[PDB]
Design a protein around this ligand. Sequence first.
Ligand code: ATP
Ligand code: ATP
Ligand code: MG
Lengths: 41, 578, 193, 127, 40, 470, 317
Amino acid sequence: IPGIRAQIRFIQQVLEQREREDTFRLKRIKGKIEAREAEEE
Amino acid sequence: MIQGVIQKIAGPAVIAKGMLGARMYDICKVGEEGLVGEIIRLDGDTAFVQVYEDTSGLKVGEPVVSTGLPLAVELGPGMLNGIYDGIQRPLERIREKTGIYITRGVVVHALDREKKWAWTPMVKPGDEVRGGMVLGTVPEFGFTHKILVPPDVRGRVKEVKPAGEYTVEEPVVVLEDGTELKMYHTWPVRRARPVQRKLDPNTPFLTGMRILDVLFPVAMGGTAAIPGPFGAGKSVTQQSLAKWSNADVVVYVGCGERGNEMTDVLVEFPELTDPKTGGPLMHRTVLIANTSNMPVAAREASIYVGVTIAEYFRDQGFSVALMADSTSRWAEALREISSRLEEMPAEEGYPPYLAARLAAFYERAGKVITLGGEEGAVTIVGAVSPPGGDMSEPVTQSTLRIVGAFWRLDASLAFRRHFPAINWNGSYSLFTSALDPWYRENVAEDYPELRDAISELLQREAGLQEIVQLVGPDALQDAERLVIEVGRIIREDFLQQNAYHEVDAYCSMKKAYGIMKMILAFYKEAEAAIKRGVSIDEILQLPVLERIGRARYVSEEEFPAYFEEAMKEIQGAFKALA
Amino acid sequence: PVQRKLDPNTPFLTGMRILDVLFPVAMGGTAAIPGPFGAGKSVTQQSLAKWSNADVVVYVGCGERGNEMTDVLVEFPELTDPKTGGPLMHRTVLIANTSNMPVAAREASIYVGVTIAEYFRDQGFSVALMADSTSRWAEALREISSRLEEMPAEEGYPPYLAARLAAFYERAGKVITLGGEEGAVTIVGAVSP
Amino acid sequence: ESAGELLVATARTQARGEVLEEVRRRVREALEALPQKPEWPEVVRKLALEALEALPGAKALVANPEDLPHLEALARERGVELQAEPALRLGVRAVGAEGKTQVENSLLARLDRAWDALSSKVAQALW
Amino acid sequence: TEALLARYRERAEAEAKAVREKAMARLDEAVALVLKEVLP
Amino acid sequence: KKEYTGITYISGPLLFVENAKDLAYGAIVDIKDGTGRVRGGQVIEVSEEYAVIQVFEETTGLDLATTSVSLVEDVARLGVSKEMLGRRFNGIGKPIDGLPPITPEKRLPITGLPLNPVARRKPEQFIQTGISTIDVMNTLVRGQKLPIFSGSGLPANEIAAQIARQATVRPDLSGEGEKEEPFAVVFAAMGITQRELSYFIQEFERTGALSRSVLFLNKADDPTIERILTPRMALTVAEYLAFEHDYHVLVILTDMTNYCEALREIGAAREEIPGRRGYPGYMYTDLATIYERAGVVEGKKGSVTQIPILSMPDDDRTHPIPDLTGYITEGQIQLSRELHRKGIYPPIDPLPSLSRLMNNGVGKGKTREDHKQVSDQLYSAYANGVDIRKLVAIIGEDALTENDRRYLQFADAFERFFINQGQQNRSIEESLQIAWALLSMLPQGELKRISKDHIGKYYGQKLEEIWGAP
Amino acid sequence: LLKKEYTGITYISGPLLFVENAKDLAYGAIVDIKDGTGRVRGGQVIEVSEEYAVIQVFEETTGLDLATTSVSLVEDVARLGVSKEMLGRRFNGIGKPIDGLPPITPEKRLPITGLPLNPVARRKPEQFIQTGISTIDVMNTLVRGQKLPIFSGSGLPANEIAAQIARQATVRPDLSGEGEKEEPFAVVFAAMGITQRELSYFIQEFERTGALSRSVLFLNKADDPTIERILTPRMALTVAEYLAFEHDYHVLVILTDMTNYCEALREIGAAREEIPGRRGYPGYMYTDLATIYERAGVVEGKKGSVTQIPILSMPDD
Ligand SMILES: Nc1ncnc2c1ncn2[C@@H]1O[C@H](COP(=O)(O)OP(=O)(O)OP(=O)(O)O)[C@@H](O)[C@H]1O
Ligand SMILES: Nc1ncnc2c1ncn2[C@@H]1O[C@H](COP(=O)(O)OP(=O)(O)OP(=O)(O)O)[C@@H](O)[C@H]1O
Ligand SMILES: [Mg+2]
C-alpha cells in the first residue's frame, strides 16, 4: 500500500507540473497577441 | 468624486476613461443602475473596474462614479438580531422592498436610519478625547451599546447633545476642529482595528462540553478548527457553543453554503432560547449569509466583514465568539477570483498567497487591552471541509499550521450513537500547558494530573484494540478486561453528553472534576480488589456503577453533595467486597 | 585541434575497487556520477583527484560549497603525488565558483576548465577533468534563457541544453596531438537531480 | 543574578534615549528659531542654489512669498521662474522642465535625513 | 532576596541620574554641533 | 431597423464590426449575407472602436463586402405561458413539433435572479418516483437537488424517461391533504444524438406524459451557445410555473457533462486562461447559478425539484465535474456497471448512494413511520451480505455460520427482487411491503435497528406477496 | 541631504507601479511611495529602463492614485544600522524595535546582502559546540562554522528543541587542551511566519533563564507584510557577521521554519511573473537559499565564527 500510494503521489506531481507549464505557455502567447494588437494593429 | 464614462465592456471587466485621480480598490458605481465594483488597475487616464453583479445590458458611454473609499462596514447600534450578506446588506429589508428575488442594483443601508435610540451622554464640553474612548451609551436589548470615537480621531469636545431619542445620524458630539461624531462610523474590512496590547492566553474559553473543555481546551482569544463530515452532528455542536459558551456575542458566518443548508440555520436560530436571559438567542448574535449563487466578491469578503464586526464588539469590551462555516468554500471563491485575474497557480490551483490570507484572517483573534482600557477577546472556530476527508488539501495544511486546536469530528462515533462525535485520538490542543495555572487556581490544584491520568487510561484502552480485534474480549485476563471496562465507563459517563437534555446539555468544570475523581478512585480500588483476588464479574455488579453513571444528570448545585456521597459509597462498597 | 582520435585501450585507475573492477573507464573515456544529496559524489571526485594515475588534474568547482574548495587548498599541499613523489598540489589546477558567486560565471568556468585540460593534453600529458556539478550550469542556462524570454523545454530548461552537454563531453578522448605526441582527457561529471 | 543588572542596563538605555530626544527637541527649536534672525537669507539662498544645482534642467523655483524677494536674485542669475506656495519653511524647492521631477530642500527634512548619522557622533560628545 | 533587587534598583536609578547629569553638562555643545552639520 | 455594415475581421466563430457602440453587451443580433441567409450571434465585447460578435453555427458564406449586422434584442428573453405544456422546443425557444408558436403572457430574461435566502423555507415533502431503491433508501424531497452519476455505457436515459413517466406526489399520505395540486415536468436535453432524441420523443408520446411536460431538446450538432442557453430557459419556465401558478415542477437535466464541455469550448473561443484541468475558473459559479434555482419559498405553494444527470468522464469521482457537482447538491445516486452487466435494471447501487434531505421527508404524516429504520436495516444487511459473498468464494459455504448463509441468501434476494424491478411501477406501500418481505428472511432479533413495535406489526410476511407477480 | 521627488506614475497593477522619467534610479534601490493622505510605503527597483522604472511595493497598494502619488529615493543599497548594544533587544524583522525601548545608535551601517567570502580567505572548521543534547553532541557533533539543519514535521516539537538549544549552547574552552581564557558567545534568533502563541512562548523562554542578555531576536509574525519575511534572515546574518568578524564573538544563528520563507519567496516570484520550478517554487530558489546559508563560516586570521542551525518542517514528511 505505501509503495502504490507513493507512485500515485509522484504521478500527480508530474501531471501537475505539465499542466502548469501549459498554463505558462498559454499566458505567454496571449501576452504576445495582446501586445501585437495594442502596439502594431 | 471622480466621474467618468464606460469605454469597453467584456464580461465582468469594465474599462472606464476620464477616471484620473481615482484610487486603487475604491468602490465604484457603474452605469445608470449603479452596479458596484472595485478598481483593480490604473493606467493613464483609464481605470479597470470589475463589477460584482452581471454586466449584461450595459452600453458604452454610461457614467462611472467613484465613491473614493474602499470596501467598508458600518459599525454602530442596530447590528444585533440582524441578518446580512457578504457585503453587509440587510436581507430582510431587501425582501420587504423587493420580494423573493434579489434584483440588481438595489440600495439599502446596513443600519436603519429611522429607529430612535435612547442617547445618554457621558462626556462634557472641554474634555479631550482620543480614539476608542466612550462618548455615551445606548440600550440595545440586553446590552448597553457603547458609542466609541473612531480610532483615528483626536480633539477636544465642543458641545454635546442632551439625553433623548435620536437616530444614528444626529451628531451627538462636535469637536473644536468642526468634526461631527455620530452613533456610527465606517471601517475598512481589510485593516485590523488597533489595540493597546495583546495578552497571553491565560484563561479558558468554556464551551460547556466536557470533552472539549477538559481533553482539548481552547483559551479565550484562541483559534480552533473542525472538519465537516456528514451526519456527525456538527451543527448541533455549533449551536450548543452558541447557547452555552461564556461568550457575550456570537457572530456566525456562512460563506459558500448550499441553499437548504443556509435555510436550516436561518430557520433554527430564531427558535433557540438564550439560557442566561431566557429570551431569544437571536438578540445576541449577528448572522452573515451567503449561498453559492451569490456574487463571488461577497463570498470572498464575508469572513472579513464578520471578523471586523467581531473586532468592533471586542473593542466595546465584550467577549465575542466567531464561527466561520466552510472556509473551504471561501478558499474556492478566492481561487476563482485569482483565476479571473490571470495569476499563476501554486499547488492545487490555489493562488500562492492562500496561506497569507488565511493567516491574516486567523491572527485577528486574541485577548487584548482595548484602546478604552478594557479587556476583550475574539475566539475563532473555523470549519474545514476537505473534498473527501483528504487532510493533505492545501487549505487544511495551511489551517492546521496556525490554529492552536483541532477537534476531529468523526462520523463513526455518530454511527454508534456517541455524542459528541469527537475522535479523541486524532484531535489535539496546544493550550493545556499555558492554561494549567488557571486550573490550579480556579478548580483544583490536582486537576491537571487527574486529566493526564484519564488521558493515559484512554490511551491504554486504545493500545489493546489489536488483541480485542484478534481475540474475543472475554479471553483476556482480569487486569486487562478491567482497563477495557473502565475505558467503557469513561466513554459512557464522562465523554458522552446529551445536548437535548435539560441539565446534561451544560457541564461546569468542577462537575467534570468530580466525575473524573470518582472514576479514578473507582479504578484504583478496583485494581486493588483485583489484586486481592476477586473476580471481575464481582466488581461488574457493584452498587456504585449506577451512582457513577447517573452523575451526569444531577443538577449543578446538587452535585457537590452527590459527589461526596458517591465518594463515601466507593470506599464503603469495596470494603464489603473481599 | 588535433591530428587523429584514437580508440582508448588503457584503464584510468581511480584507486576504488568497485569502480576499477566492476565499471572501469578508459583513459579517453567519459563518466557520469548522478546521485541525491549526501550520496558521495564530492568524496569520490576528491579520491580520484588524490589517487588517480593522471599526470594533471583539473578540478572545476561549479556552483558548490566554499568549504569544499578550502579543504582542497588546505590539505593538498601536505599530501604526496602518487607518481612523481612531489607535493600533490603541484599537479592540480582549481577553478572555483561557489554557490553565492555570480550565476552566469558557472558556464564560463566549465569552458575554462575544459580548455585548460585540452592545453595540457596538447602538451602530451594525460589529464583528468572533474566537474563538480553540471546541474548548476544547467540552472544558469535556464536563468539566462528566462531573461531572454525564450520558450522553454521540459522543466523550463532551454531546448539546446543537450547540444551544450554533448559539445562539452565530446572534448574528451585519446588523441595524437598536432605536435605528434600522444595525450588524453578524461571527464567525470557529477549530476544532482 | 542578571535580573538586577538587566534593570541597570534598561535604565541606562532609557536615560540615553531621553537625553537624545531632548537634544533633538533643542535642535528643532533652534532650527525653527532661524527665520526670526538675520542668518536666514544667506542659508535660504544657499539652499535654493543647492536645489537648482541638483536639477540641471530646472524650470521654476517655488517657495513661500516671504522668501521670493531674496530668491529674485537667484532667479535673475539662473533664469528660472519663481512662484509662491505655502510650502514647508526653512528651505526652497524646484520643479524640473518636464514637470515629472522635483527637489525639496527644507531644513527640517535635512535634520530628519541627517539625524541617523549624527546620533552616533553626538553620543560620544554627550559621554 | 528582594533586598538584592531593591539594591540593584537603587544603583540603577543612581547611575541613570548620573548619566543624565553628565549629558546635561554637554547638551549645548552637541546642539551646536548638530546645527553645524545640518546647515549648508 | 438599423443595420451595421462595417465588418473588418472574420475568423472562426468571431467577427468584428466597426462603429457599433449602440450595441449593448450580451445582445442578440442577426447576421445577413449576400444570398439573404440569416444567422444569429451574441455580442461578447463592446468598445468605442469595434464590437465582437460570436456567430451561431458557421461562417461559410460570409464576406467583408456584403455582410450586415442588425440588432434583435438587448437581453436574451423567453416568452412563457401555461400553453407551453405539451410542447417541444429546440433550446432557444423555437417550437419543433410543427405546432403554431405560442402567444406569450410575458417575456422573461433567461438568466435568473438569485432567491433571497430569508425567503426560502425548509423542504419537508417527498416525491414518489416509483423506484424502490430511490423511494425507500434515497428518498427525493420536494425542493432537493439530487443528481445521478452514470457511466459511459449505462442506461441513464432510460432511467430519466422512467422517472419522468412515473413521478407524482402523494397528497393522500399527508394528513388529509388536497386531492388536486398541479404537477409538471420540465425536460432539458443537451448535446444528445438523433437516436436519443427519437427515444425520448417516442417515450413521452406513447404514454400521455407529454400532456404534463415541457421539452427543450438540443442536438449534438446544434450550436454550442444553444447548449449553454438551454438549461437556463428550462429553469426559467420551471420557476415561472412554480412561483406564479403554484405548480409542483420536476426538472431533469439530461447530461451536464455536455454542458461543461460546451462551457469549456466557449471559454476557450474567447481567449480566457483555463483553470484546473483545462476547465474555466468560474465553472463552480456557473454550476451554482444553474443548480441553486430550485427550492421552496415561504408563502408560496409551488416548488422546484432538480435531478441533474451527468456521465462521469472515466468513472472517476475525482474529476472536476462530479467534484464540483458534489459541493452544490444534496447527495447523489450512483449507477453500477456490475449490476448492469448482471442484467439488473435499474442498476442503482444503494451502498454509494446518499440523499442528504431524506430525514425530513419521511416519518409520520408523510410516507410511513417505519421508513427510516427499515432503510437503515436494509443498508446494513446488504453490506453484510455483499461482504459474506466475497468471503464464501475462499472459505466455502459449509464453513459459514447459519446467519452468514442467511445474509448471503438475503443479498441475492435483494438484488433479484428489490433492485431488479424492471419497467414495473411501484408505490411506496408496495416497496415497503417488498422490503419487509425481504427482511423476514433474516431472523427476528437480528433486526437491531428496528424498534420492536414495527417488528411486531409488520414482520412475518412471506415473499410470495410479490413473488406471485414480480 | 536634499530629496528628489518623482511624480510620473503611469501604471499601477497589483504590486507593481511604473515611474516615467526616473532615469537616475539605480537598479535594486530602495524607494519611498507617498500618497495623498501622507502615508509612506517602501519599494524596490526591480527593473529600470529608459522608458520607465519598475517598483515593487512592499505591501498592499490600496489608496494609490496616478494624480497625487510621488516616489523618493531612500538609499542606493539596503542597509542596516548595527551596534554592539543590540544584545538583549527584540526587533520585528525589518530592524525596528518592538520591546518598548529606544532605538539604538548605529555604530555602522552595513548592506544586508553582504559579499561572498573568498575561498582562499576561509579556513577549515575545527572546534565543536556543546548543545547539551546527547545525540547531537556525541553522534552528530556541531562544529564552529558549520550549517546543520533540523528536518522536522507537522506536529513535532521543533520550537522546544530550538529554545532548548538556544538556552543550553556553550563553547567549553577548558576542553581545548590549552585551557584558554573564556571567549564571548552570542545567539542570534530569527523567527519567520511565527504566530502570537509561539511568540509569547519564545519571549517567556528567553526571559525565564536570563538567556536574553546574550541574544538578539528578530521576530516576524504571520500577519506581517510578506516582504519582511524575505529580509529577516539577511538582517540576522548581517548582525551575526558584524559581531563575529569585528568583535571576535562565537555567534550561533537559529532560523526557525524556513518553510515560511519558501512560501514568501514563491509568493513574490509569482507576483513578478517568473518561470516556476518543480512545485511552483521559483527556479532560482537554490541560489537564493545559498546566498543565505553560505554566509556562515570561519575566516583565516580572525577568531570569531558564525554557525547556523536552520529549522524546517518537511511537508507530508
Ligand atoms: N450533542 C448531541 N447530543 C445529542 N444528540 C446529538 C448531539 N449531536 C448530534 N445529535 C443527534 O445526532 C444527529 C446528528 O446527525 P445529523 O446529520 O442530524 O447532524 P447535523 O447536526 O445536522 O450535522 P452534519 O451537517 O454534520 O450532518 C442529530 O440530528 C441529533 O439527533
Ligand atoms: N567513500 C566514502 N568513504 C567514507 N565516507 C564517505 C564516502 N563517501 C561519502 N562519505 C560520507 O558521506 C558524506 C557526504 O558525501 P559527499 O560530501 O561526497 O556528498 P555529495 O554526494 O557530494 O553531496 P552534495 O549534493 O551535498 O554535494 C561525506 O561527508 C562522508 O561523511
Ligand atoms: Mg558535493
